[PDB]
Each structure stands twice: as C-alpha cells, then as structure tokens.
Design a protein around this ligand. Structure first.
Ligand SMILES: CCCCCCCCCCCCCC(=O)SCCNC(=O)CCNC(=O)[C@H](O)C(C)(C)COP(=O)(O)OP(=O)(O)OC[C@H]1O[C@@H](n2cnc3c(N)ncnc32)[C@H](O)[C@@H]1OP(=O)(O)O
Ligand SMILES: Cc1nn(C)c(C)c1CCOc1c(-c2ccc3c(c2)c(CN(C)C)nn3C)ccc(F)c1F
Ligand SMILES: [Cl-]
Length: 385
C-alpha cells in the first residue's frame, strides 16, 4: 500500500507503465567515484559479516539461517531447504564477488541473523544487453521480522554492486512490489502422488480415489528421445549454441558465456541435472532441472518434499510436449516427488496435456533502475534459483 522504502528507489511506481519505445535506466551517467564507501549503519549489537561461501563453516552458517528462516508457502506448511552444496553452486558462478555475499551477525552470540547475495550476469532486456547483479537469498531471522532490516540489507548490497560500476539488477519475489516487469504463476506435476496426498500438497475427491490418482500420474519409463544422457564437459560448446540461440527470442534472458554454461549446467548430484541429445556431434536437445527440497513442517512421517524445478529446456528433434514429458521422466528416475515449473518460455503450452496442476501463487520478475514495457510471462526467458 504505502511502499515507504521502495518509493525512494529507482523503480516504477505502482501505476507507472511504459510503452515499448522506452528501455533505459531511471538514473543514468552514474559515477563509481561518488558511491558511498562507508557501510550502512546497523542497529546497535549487529555487525556486517563477509561470508566466504567456499569455506565449509561459513557456508554452513548460511545453510542454517535459510533452513530455519527462509521462504515458506502461503500456508506455512513447507519451507525451502536449499542444501549447502546447492548454495555453493548458486553463489560461485563465473566472476562472482565474495563481497556480494553479505551477512549480518548478532554480536553477543556471534550468530548470523541476516543474509543477502548477488551474482553478476549479462541480462538482455528488450534486446538491450546490460551488466547486472542477480539478487537472491534475502533472509532475516524470524525473530527479527518487521524491524526494517531488509531495506538496510538491500541498500548495502546496492552500494557494493555500484562500487563495481554496475547500476542495474534483476530479482524475483513472491510478494508484490513496485513494479513487476512480468508475473509467472507456478504449476506442479505430481510424481509420487501418495506422498503428496499424505503431506497435504495434493488432494483427492470422490471421483479421484487414491488408486485413480496413482494411475492418472503414472508414467511410462521410456524416453521419447532415446539418447538423452547426462551432460559432460565435451557438450559445453553445443549447449552454449543450442540454448543461446533459443533464448534470443525472449524479452528477458541471461546472455551466457561458455564459462557460465559449464557452471550452470554441468551436473552435480542433488543440485543440478542436465541431459542432452547429441546427434552427429551436435547437441540438438537439452533438459535441465535443479533440486530444491522443502522441509515439511510438523509432519511426523515425512521431513522433506523432494522437488525438481524446471530450469532450461530446448528441443529441435521432438515436440516441446515430448521433451517436457522426458523431463518429468528423468526427474522421476532421480527419485523426485514433484516436478515444478513456471509459466515462462514455452512451458504453459504443455501444462494441461502433461497433467500439471496450478499452484497457489506467482513469482514476480523485477528490474532495479530500469524502465521498460512489461510483458506476459511466456516472453520471460530466465529462471532464478
Ligand atoms: C544496482 C544494484 C541493486 C541491487 C538491489 C536490487 C533490489 C533487491 C531487492 C531484494 C530482492 C530479494 C530477492 C529474494 O531473495 S526473494 C526471497 C525473499 N526471502 C524470503 O521471503 C524469506 C522469508 N522472509 C524474510 O526473510 C523477510 O520477510 C524478508 C527479509 C524478505 C523481509 O524482511 P521483513 O519482513 O522483516 O521486512 P522489513 O521490515 O525488514 O522490511 C520491509 C520492507 O522490505 C520490503 N520487502 C519485503 N520482502 C521483500 C522482498 N522479498 N524483496 C524486496 N523487498 C521486500 C517491504 O515491501 C518493505 O518495503 P516497503 O513496502 O515499506 O517499501
Ligand atoms: C513447493 C514449495 N515449497 N515452498 C516453500 C514454496 C514457496 C513452494 C512453491 C514453489 O513455487 C515455485 C517457485 C517459487 C515460488 C515462490 C518463491 C520462489 C520460488 C523463491 C525462490 N527464488 C526464485 C527467489 N522465492 N519465492 C518467494 C518457483 C518455480 C516453481 F516452479 C515453483 F513451483
Ligand atoms: Cl539511506
């Protein structure tokens, strides 16, 4: 309603809208020399802490903070449980900066109570490519909510990003803020349907008995693209071409270098899965999904929902439906309970046929210090972790 913090920031007002001829910063001609060199003031008893995510102990402190205090679903039934190895992968992409991994400690206990992170990436927005920061993993301890700590974290990481002569950022949130460039509902494809029913993720009715639900979501254990196999280092050049060509159609996407392709797609158990179809030495199809479990709050039988999240998928030798059918199958083969996807890129066109259910909310895409026309989520070509 009031947006007292966000209306001090270079972002659109709630009722602002720009036509497609507008694609530029709110504030231009920024000078690194004029950026503040002092850290933002914290309340007494709290201090900034630079986290070394490559140090197991520092990384474990971040892991604990998020496990206990990060995103929950709208009904406080699930809480994200990013693994420590996932956080390593998500935060140490090519040319990342340690000083963009910012913690807040409570001095008396020496314990982390706040975190925010960014990584650098080239972002193409309406065909214009801008060096940006991708902001993620903003988290304040549950006991310290609504004390205006989040604006301090946001202003401090803004300052540190500006020190590197970067003046734009991309971020996503479930909360509505000024002002989304796009808004994407999420959908869920049941794989282990008995577990999903028992934990309250899915439901039954008189027409859909347990046995009927299990049969509805049963899948054939045979791939439409028979040679889909785990990506290897030799495939980096081919994935770079296949995905890079595909993404140029969208209004918002990351312009991956080959080093970034290797980092974001080479498979890591329980973190990132990429499968490729190689034909005549060329990569002609790819499937990828990442592992993001949710802790199941207060369930005595199951502690974790094992969820695969659709990442980037491209096909040239099958239909997109056939490709995403294989994606579901590959997630099932890797013991995931549910396959989750946003209505971005071509995804929505397969949701009905492949038996996805609509979820309870949406993920909003935002840019910082950029004015441009908004667009439908099918024009979004980027997925943030
Ligand atoms: C050039 C470089 C620029 C770099 C920066 C680019 C921007 C990056 C922006 C960050 C991108 C994050 C990407 C992700 O990580 S999205 C993941 C967000 N994390 C969670 O949801 C975890 C669980 N919740 C929490 O930890 C806290 O509730 C957080 C920390 C989220 C808010 O803490 P708290 O609830 O204790 O609130 P407060 O009293 O301190 O602060 C209230 C103010 O903060 C605004 N708020 C609330 N939630 C969010 C949110 N998710 N993005 C942006 N702003 C948010 C809110 O509208 C209000 O402002 P205004 O309404 O009064 O104006
Ligand atoms: C399961 C589950 N367990 N928990 C704890 C939730 C919230 C869910 C729903 C997940 O919804 C998503 C999200 C999705 C939706 C909201 C999100 C997120 C992802 C993120 C993480 N990144 C993108 C910032 N933050 N927020 C607020 C992104 C892509 C999807 F395909 C989803 F199904
Ligand atoms: Cl200020």
């Amino acid at each position: 309603p009031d947006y007292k913090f966000w209306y001090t920031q270079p972002v659109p007002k709630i009722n602002d809208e720009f036509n497609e001829s507008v694609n530029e910063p709110f504030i231009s001609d920024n000078k690194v020399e004029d950026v503040r060199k002092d850290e933002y003031k914290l309340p007494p008893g709290y201090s900034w802490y630079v986290c070394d995510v490559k140090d197991e102990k520092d990384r474990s402190e971040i892991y604990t903070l998020l496990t206990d205090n990060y995103v929950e679903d709208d009904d406080n039934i699930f809480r994200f449980n990013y693994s420590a190895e996932f956080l390593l992968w998500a935060l140490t992409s090519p040319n990342y900066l340690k000083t963009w991994h910012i913690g807040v400690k409570y001095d008396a206990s020496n314990k982390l109570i706040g975190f925010i992170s960014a990584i650098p990436t080239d972002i193409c927005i309406h065909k214009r490519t801008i060096k940006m920061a991708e902001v993620n993993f903003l988290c304040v301890h549950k006991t310290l909510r609504s004390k205006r700590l989040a604006p301090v974290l946001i202003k401090e990481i803004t300052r540190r990003i500006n020190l590197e002569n970067i003046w734009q950022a991309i971020y996503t949130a479930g909360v509505y803020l000024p002002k989304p460039v796009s808004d994407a509902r999420y959908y869920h494809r049941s794989i282990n349907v008995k577990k999903l029913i028992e934990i309250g993720f899915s439901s039954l009715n008189s027409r859909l008995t347990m046995s009927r639900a299990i049969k509805l979501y049963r899948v054939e254990d045979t791939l439409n693209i028979k040679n889909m196999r785990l990506m290897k280092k030799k495939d980096v050049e081919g994935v770079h071409k296949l995905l890079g060509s595909y993404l140029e159609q969208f209004n918002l996407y990351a312009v991956f270098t080959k080093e970034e392709i290797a980092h974001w797609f080479l498979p890591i158990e329980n973190v990132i899965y990429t499968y490729v179809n190689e034909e005549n030495g060329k990569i002609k199809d790819m499937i990828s999904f990442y592992s993001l479990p949710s802790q199941i709050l207060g369930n005595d039988k199951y502690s974790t929902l094992n969820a695969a999240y659709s990442f980037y998928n491209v096909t040239t030798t099958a239909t997109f439906k056939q490709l995403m059918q294989d994606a579901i199958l590959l997630a099932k083969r890797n013991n995931f309970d549910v396959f989750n996807a946003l209505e971005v890129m071509q995804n929505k066109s397969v949701f009905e046929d492949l038996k996805f259910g609509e979820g309870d909310g949406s993920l909003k895409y935002y840019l910082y210090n950029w004015k441009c026309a908004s667009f439908a989520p099918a024009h979004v070509g980027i997925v943030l972790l």
